[PDB]
Amino acid sequence: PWSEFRLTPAEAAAAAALAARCAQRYDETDGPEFLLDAPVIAHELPRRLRTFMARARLDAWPHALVVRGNPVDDAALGSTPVHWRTARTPGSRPLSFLLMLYAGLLGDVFGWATQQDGRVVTDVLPIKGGEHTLVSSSSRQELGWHTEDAFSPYRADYVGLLSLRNPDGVATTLAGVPLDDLDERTLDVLFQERFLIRPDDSHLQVNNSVEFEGIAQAADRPEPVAILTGHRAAPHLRVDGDFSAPAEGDEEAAAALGTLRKLIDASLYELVLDQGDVAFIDNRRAVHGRRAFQPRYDGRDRWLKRINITRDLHRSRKAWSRVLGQR
């Protein structure tokens, strides 16, 4: 259900070489300079990869675009950081640039003022003491399926994930719209503005080191929104298993959401991002999550770099440029 591309060793080496050169020439991935240049520098990636990204993005069906086979040297990479705060390590620097280059082929990258200190390239790793939380630094508790930043009209079109390491093969989870099982009445209701979607815990002040006011308003006074939009035969999806609810006292909407939860749970499947694998999850066609795992805390924990991507930065003008948020 996803579109997959495997780099040849030579293509992977070329891509890595390009990223290393970027790492040499630019101070940081999130600097204004590299943010502007990355989409043009990405034109120098291997042609077969550029072709895959240009075409696969336009296909009607894939839940994600997956690129396998980027080399990662654990010795060069170094130990998995204990927190996202200190996760911009020299060993992980070239791979962060690599992710941004791939991302630039798909759209405009951005971050959130209220998430990991406004960083554009973010980190997914287990944080000691946060095993049973609802955020991506969890481990022992499964990260439930969700549309990324479901609360926001400015949520990403694609979520990019690059696996720096994943020694025990922990699965990312995905599900599309369960169209084979949604009856027309349920479908009709899911297309109506009868649902409340609150911001997830990654946007809380406690999970960072004026935009928090907007988050508080989205949490306190969510306006009713639809779960499905667009074409009945291929709807776009906006839902969060741990932060969605029906509108106050709307039992029809509730029943539709209840049914949707059951169908998504039943159709949820696994994608293992092995070391060096990159996935760009279509945040409109699919929800995603991560399986429960036992963290190590020995320096070799599973570690991903992540980036939010929009097809059009100007659609979020109200929340501006590369770091989004509102009052």
Place this chain on the structure above:
Amino acid sequence: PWSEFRLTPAEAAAAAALAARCAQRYDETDGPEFLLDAPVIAHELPRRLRTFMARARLDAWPHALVVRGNPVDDAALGSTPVHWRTARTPGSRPLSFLLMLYAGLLGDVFGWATQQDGRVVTDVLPIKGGEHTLVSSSSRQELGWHTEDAFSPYRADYVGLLSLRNPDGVATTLAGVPLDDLDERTLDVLFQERFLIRPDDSHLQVNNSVEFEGIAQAADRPEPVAILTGHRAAPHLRVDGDFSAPAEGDEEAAAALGTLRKLIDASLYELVLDQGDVAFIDNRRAVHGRRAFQPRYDGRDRWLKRINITRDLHRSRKAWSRVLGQR
């Protein structure tokens, strides 16, 4: 108020050479093959141009992106066609490929099932007998300002225009949102769903050689929509001077539209696309039109190639792929 780039002779020659090679290798511009390949082939355009297009698209202010200095040889080009039907002349073929290459740097190109026989690259030229019409083949009557395909939620983000010839320097017209003069109450009303926007005459059966049913429904039963959307301090614009109206009996909406017409008329400015100039008009920030001119009908009339561009083809899934329309 637009962003301008001038090709050096060498850059222009290189771009032309690239387009000529495409014209040699592909049967047509609108074929599935070239539609898919163009965005990747465009990576081979001159780097300074690719840089301009990548950055200028992300700027907050421009009403259009303008590229000057593509050579056009009138002798090679041949005479201006008498109708769009016969306008895919060998002389104009390389320049059509050139426009599609530039367009591919900005987004996904598409056409309409109900406009110029579903062509993606379309033609703007004066048609004898149609001087006083509301379509782009007019001449003696000014083409009034408009958002392109304002009636449709799937209208282009950018409209690309390449001037094949314009010997008498006829001006394209542009206007942005008149924010310096819209009072808050008027602004509030323009942001509300209190306006009717009907499809323009280019979507009629008479202006072509099941999607016409959708056009008929948009004409007969238009649903109320807003004129302004997005950020109050930089709104997006959706209006058509010859096809917009207030909702039935809504005099407040009417007064807001009346005021907007006056302010747009007063702020309308001119952009002359000389032979070889290309403009990508931001269809969300600006309305555009064309000044009245006396047509020649001697074979050297003003002639443009045109293309519709979206940042995201999947947003129009309901109306699908590269040729849009509904029942």
